Amino acid sequence: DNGKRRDVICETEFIYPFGNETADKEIEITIHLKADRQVGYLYTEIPTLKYNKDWLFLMTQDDCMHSAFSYTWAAIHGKPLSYIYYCDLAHLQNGDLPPDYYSLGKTLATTNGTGQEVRFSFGTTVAADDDLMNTQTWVQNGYTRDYFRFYKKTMLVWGNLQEMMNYGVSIAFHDLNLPDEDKTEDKLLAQFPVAQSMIREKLNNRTCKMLAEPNGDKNYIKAALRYDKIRTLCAQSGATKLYPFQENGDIEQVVIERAFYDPPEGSGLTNPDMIKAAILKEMENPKEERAAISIGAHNTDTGWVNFLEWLNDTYGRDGDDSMWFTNQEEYYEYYYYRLHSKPEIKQVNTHTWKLTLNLNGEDSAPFYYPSVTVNIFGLKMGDIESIKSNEDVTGLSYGDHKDFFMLNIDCRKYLAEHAENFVKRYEANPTDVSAKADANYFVNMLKDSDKKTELKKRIE
């Protein structure tokens, strides 16, 4: 019965198996050259930014906000949007949508430089030790007497966050659920693993390794630095301003500067207005001199949706494609790989070269974004007869970039199974155009293989 009221715990039907992610990757890529395209010398590098992007945009949305799902994630991923209301996952699953719903008609993305979509990525803080994440959702298709079920909740429900994990959204600690008088360095330290246990319980054993400092409270940074599962942090003061082409040190347990760009009081401007201005000023510098545009957000709204679309239209897929729009965790891992992994390329015979690279995360927990870009200098796409890869490589896209050759190498161990889960969701909901688009997007992440061919056939 469609029209009967139900009050449900939002749930998604699969979550990427973060707990099973392998920590160590051994990449072996074999390149076979055409007969009259024998080259003399090849050498390799991991570039400063993934996909050979020019500049970095980092976004972390604080306070575990309902709008991180209903506005930020939904706008990025081509989902139904509202101007004043707040969908939960169960509303989207059931087609119970608010009375002003609309869609942008596209996802918001860059490319990877080798012909594939890379949707914008961001992180949200999590109030994992707060029982309000267990709030129910009222679903009632066709009910128009009121729209109370679409009002803003005080925070994300777990099911919303679980689904966001399937799209690579990151997580961070923020406020912990202690009495204000108990927010001492030592007591906060003891409460971090309590919150972590709930994160792991709900997010298929993903370990959170980031703190977004709350309310300028430096006791949170002091405590987090004694909890070795936290590897990266952000704050507005007491931090390091990130210049991606200049930064040379270890950034393990480093507080990276982030700004909210609040507008002057009564000036009628919005935080997106302020960030847009800061971006324009920063782009006037050569890329090597640019800071990262490292932002925080609280509640997102229609103005934020339009700003994300502006970024897509100006510096993303529908503009000059110069931006890497990602979350701080993915960037942290990439920087770690660039610092510690050393790609090598060796000639096997006159027309065969073997590219090797080891991706090893830190000892705390498996890294969750084990993908890199490797540039090969001296090679062009037109030289290549075939490229093969070993089992640790699950996604592989490549082609010319400027006067050299780039490979985008994804080693997420369960990526093919994850793409198939999106295919199964589409097969169970074959009239959902967004479900078909998601299936095509995840299947296009996979390297050429029998399984990719199978999944492509199922989503024609």
Stretch that binds Cu ion, among 91-99, 129-137, 214-222, 445-453 (CB under 5 A): 214-222
Would you call 434 helix, strand, or coil by DSSP? helix
Q: How many chain residues are in contact with Cu ion, going by CB under 5 A?
A: 3
Q: Compare residues 37 and 298 and give the one whose CB is closer to Cu ion.
A: 298
Least distance in angstroms from the C-beta of 85 to Cu ion: 23
Contacts of 271 (CB under 8 A, 6+ apart): 260, 261, 262, 263, 297, 304
Q: Compare residues 214 and 378 and give the one whose CB is closer to Cu ion.
A: 214
Task: Give the contact letters, 169-208, x = binds to Cu ion (CB under 5 A), - = no.
Answer: ----------------------------------------
The closest residue (CB) to Cu ion is 62
Query: Is 129 near Cu ion (CB under 5 A)?
Result: no
Least distance in angstroms from the C-beta of 222 to Cu ion: 17
Least distance in angstroms from the C-beta of 242 to Cu ion: 21
Rg of the chain in Å (alpha carbons): 22
63 belongs to an annotated ligand binding site = yes
Least distance in angstroms from the C-beta of 137 to Cu ion: 24
Least distance in angstroms from the C-beta of 191 to Cu ion: 16
Q: Are 89 and 10 in contact (CB under 8 A)?
A: yes
Query: Of the candidates 21, 54, 63, 438, which one interacts with Cu ion according to CB under 5 A?
Result: 63
Q: Compare residues 124 and 371 and give the one whose CB is closer to Cu ion.
A: 124
Query: Is 260 near Cu ion (CB under 5 A)?
Result: no
52: closest CA among 426, 405, 453, 428? Answer: 405
Token pair recorded at residue 7: 């009050």
Q: Compare residues 52 and 67 and give the one whose CB is closer to Cu ion.
A: 67
Q: Compare residues 165 and 297 and give the one whose CB is closer to Cu ion.
A: 297
Strand partners, 389: 29
Strand partners, 234: 212, 256
Least distance in angstroms from the C-beta of 64 to Cu ion: 9
- For 337-344, the CB contacts below 8 A with 24+ separation are 337/46, 337/372, 338/46, 338/48, 338/372, 339/250, 341/46, 341/372, 343/44, 343/45, 343/46, 343/374, 344/44
> CA separation (Å) from 112 to 294, 367, 398, 412, 444?
21, 20, 9, 16, 12
Interface positions, 3-62, toward Cu ion (CB under 5 A):
62
Query: Is 214 near Cu ion (CB under 5 A)?
Result: yes
In a 10 Å sphere around its CB, with 0-12 CB exposed, 13-18 middle and 19+ buried, how is residue 329 labelled? buried
Q: Compare residues 77 and 258 and give the one whose CB is closer to Cu ion.
A: 258
One-letter amino acid of 270: T
Q: Compare residues 172 and 293 and give the one whose CB is closer to Cu ion.
A: 172
Strand partners, 118: 110
Would you call 195 helix, strand, or coil by DSSP? helix
Q: Compare residues 95 and 214 and give the one whose CB is closer to Cu ion.
A: 214
Count of CA atoms in the C-beta half-sphere (13 A) of 431: 3
174 belongs to an annotated ligand binding site = yes
422: closest CA among 405, 394, 443, 403? Answer: 443
Least distance in angstroms from the C-beta of 215 to Cu ion: 6
Least distance in angstroms from the C-beta of 134 to Cu ion: 21
Binding site, annotated residues for Cu(2+): 63, 174
Residues near Cu ion (CB under 5 A) are 62-63, 214
Binding site, annotated residues: 63, 174
Binding site, annotated residues for Zn(2+): 63, 174
